[model samples]
Structure formats: structure tokens, C-alpha cells
Target: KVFGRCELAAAMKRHGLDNYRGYSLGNWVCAAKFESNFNTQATNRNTDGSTDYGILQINSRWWCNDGRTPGSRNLCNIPCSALLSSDITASVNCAKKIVSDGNGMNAWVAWRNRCKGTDVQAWIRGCRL
Candidate 1:
């Protein structure tokens, strides 16, 4: 599913993504915008043979195991395919794990390059949450 800006914001908010680990809701919204453009099925293969999956683009290298990435730690202990589901519970849970694992939102380069230290209010500006 391709979520609208407010739609994604609402979902994230419901998932308690607001102010998670000192990062604002805007950061999560902004990261999803650039990472997968709010597309649930988004996937990208890295040169290192790992793949990023789903809206949050959780990586197979450490988060989810696709059974394809060599030496996958599967820190989330979930299949990568779970991340592609339109129901984003798994993806969101895994994302929280990533942040709680001390990586913070910097786990996603998209977040670092696009949302980090930026005025991301626009990402959730009109969203009534």
C-alpha cells in the first residue's frame, strides 16, 4: 500500500513512534518518505548482497532474514518477507528494535541524509495526531 503523508503519520503515531528514543514523529515520517515513499512492498538490494525491505526498509543483513543474505543475524528474528506486508506491524516493531539497539534512527542512511537534523515538521505538519 502507498500511504499518504497523513495516513502514514497516523499509523506511526498509533504505533507509538512519536518521540521514540528522543526522535520526533516527524523523523519517522520523514525517514519513511525518502526510504520507500510510503510503499509497503518496497525493496532494494545492496551491493553487499543484503536487501532492504518494506516501508521502513529494514535490512536483511541484521534485522530480518531473507535466507539469501549471507551471515544474516536476523536480530528481529523475522523473515524479510514479513516486512513487505501491507500490515506494517512487523516492520514497525523491527524498526523500534533497530533504534533500541543503539543505532537510533541513524540506522537508515536515508534518515541520516534526509531527516537528520533537518526541519521535518513538514513531514507531519497537517496531520492531526
Candidate 2:
């Protein structure tokens, strides 16, 4: 499912992403936009032989086990396919774990290159929480 900007914001807010780990809802929304454009089914194969999954594009290399990514830690303790669900709960949980693990939002290259050090508030502006 593809979410509109406000819809994605509301969903993330519902998942407790608002101000999570010192990152605002805008931070999550902005990063999701660049990472997967709010498409729950998005996937990207990396050159490292790992695949990124879901709206936040969690990587199989460390977060979820796809049973194919070499050296996968499955830190989220979930199958990589779980991240592709439209519910987004699994993806959000894994995302929180990523941040809580000291990676911050910088764990995602899209976040670092597009959302980091920027005025991400625009991503969620006018969206009622």
C-alpha cells in the first residue's frame, strides 16, 4: 500500500514514532519518503547481496533475516517479509530497535543523505497528529 504524506505521518504517529529517540515524526516521515516513498511493498537489492525491505527499507544484512543475506544477524528477530506488510507495526518496531541500538536514524543511507541535518518538519507540516 502506498500512503499519502499525511497518512504516513498519522500511521507513524500511531506507532509511537513521534519524538522517538529524540527524532520527530517528521524525521521518520522524511526518511520514509526518500527510502521507499511510503510504499509498503518496496524492496531494493543491495550490492552487498542484502535486500532492503518495507517503507523504512530495513536491511536484511542486520535487521531481518531473509535466509539469503550472508551474515544476517536478524536483530529484529523477524523474517524480512514481515517488513512488507501494510500494517507497518513490524517495520516500526524494527526501526525503533535500530535507533535504540545506537545507530540513530543514520542506519539508513536515505535518512543520512536526504533527511539528516535538514528541515524535516516540512515532511509532516499541516498533518494533524
Candidate 3:
């Protein structure tokens, strides 16, 4: 209980974002938490006015410029099927891909408080690996 879902949930919580006030993680809480802090209303429009978006903190130009509303579930990188299906865990996996492609897990590890430990197995137990 302390390792998987709790760990994941705790990971998201510690980042100071509300439990995503939207359909945000409806697809992938893990991915969203890994990228952004899990706040659908979350916006990282840095002081420099960079292009980052909610839960997944994705590059808004690529995802948002597509014209999906800012807080809509469609803004994330999850696949069409997963989004429509509202498959929460599946969506997170999709979000993971963006991270994996960019060699970010090391950063994830560096951000241990964000995605620390090997409880991925535990995460599977609750989220149905």
C-alpha cells in the first residue's frame, strides 16, 4: 500500500498541484505526474513565456497549437483510443513515452521525490499492470 498507488499518488501530491481539476489524468496519471505536477489547471507559462502545458507539462506549441482547449483532455499526448476510452493508466503509459523518448527517466530519478523508487511493480498491482 505504501509503495505503489500511494507512492504514485503521493508523488503527485507532493508537487503542490491539486488532484487535477479536469479530465486531466483521466487517461494517464503516472505520465501526467511524471511530466507536470498533476494539475489540469496547472500552467507553466514561465516568466520567459515558454510553451508548457498542464499535468503533462507538454510543449504547448505542438500539443496545444493543435487547437484543443487548454484544459481539455485532448491536450495530452495519449493516443486517440485511450483518450476516448478514458483509460487512465493507459494514458499515463502514453505520457511516459514522451519522457522515455527524451531520455528523461534519469531526470525522473533525479527528481526522485517526483518519481522515485522501484515501486513501478506496486503501481502495476493497483493500476492493473
Candidate 4:
């Protein structure tokens, strides 16, 4: 969608992701920033031939089906294109499944490189969360 940092932070909080699965809001927000810059339509092909979807860049290897990636597990059981919508309920729910499976925010390399051990306060700076 067209969410800015503030809006994303609030959405995360509203969606019960404010402190989801023991990861802070900043961590998720930070990952979203680097992963897709909060663009809902974001998608990228990985070197492994898998594809990443939505703001969090959930992978096709074990997540959604893009109809282009081969051997897609589609564990999330939703079409990858569905993630491009402004309503992030499906994406966020899939994220919860990923996190519960123990990947947590680390599933996103952006979190390890950009958000891990970094100050992410700016991701929610003046947000009225």
C-alpha cells in the first residue's frame, strides 16, 4: 500500500504485531523498510530461483505461489499476487506462521543486515502508536 513509517507502525500494532512473537515493532518495521520500503506490490526473484513477496518479502520456496516459481511449496496456501493488495492481513498472518516456525524476523535478510543490533526508533519516530 502507500503506508509511511508511521502508518505502518500503527498498522503493525493494530494487527497485533506491535510486539509480535517477541520481536519489537521496530524490528518488523525496519525489516519492511529494507525489504520493500513498505510497498505492497513489491516482489523480487532470489538467486536460488525462489521469489520474495510483499513488504516482508516472504519467499516462494516455502510461502506463497507466484505461478512462476517452480517447486513452490505454497505453504501459506495463498497466491503470491494476493500479497500485492493494500490489505496486508494475509501477508501478516503468513508472517506469523513463519515466525512461529522459529525463523522470526531473521527470515528476512534485511533484518539481519539492517535492523539487527541497530537502532530502529526512526522507523516509528513520531508515530502516534
lDDT of each: 0.91, 0.93, 0.40, 0.86
Give the alpha carbon lDDT tens digit for every residue of 63-104 in model 4: 888888877799889998888889888889889888888666
TM-score of each: 0.97, 0.96, 0.37, 0.93
TM-score of 2: 0.96
- Tens digits of per-residue lDDT, candidate 2, 8-54, equal 99999998999999999999999999999999999999999999999
Superposed by TM-score, candidate 2 places the C-alpha of residue 116 at a distance from the truth, in angstroms, of: 1.2
Which candidate ranks first by lDDT, i.e. highest?
Answer: 2
Q: Report the alpha-carbon TM-score of model 3 versus the true structure.
A: 0.37
**Which 10 successive residues of model 1 have the least lDDT summed?**
98-107
lDDT of 3 by residue, 7-62 (tens): 54544444322233221221234444555554443445544344454444555433
Would you list the clashing residue pairs of candidate 3? 27-88, 28-92
TM-score of 1: 0.97
> Cα deviation of 59 in candidate 2 (Å)?
0.5
Q: Candidate 4, clashing residue pairs?
A: none
Global Cα lDDT for candidate 3 = 0.40
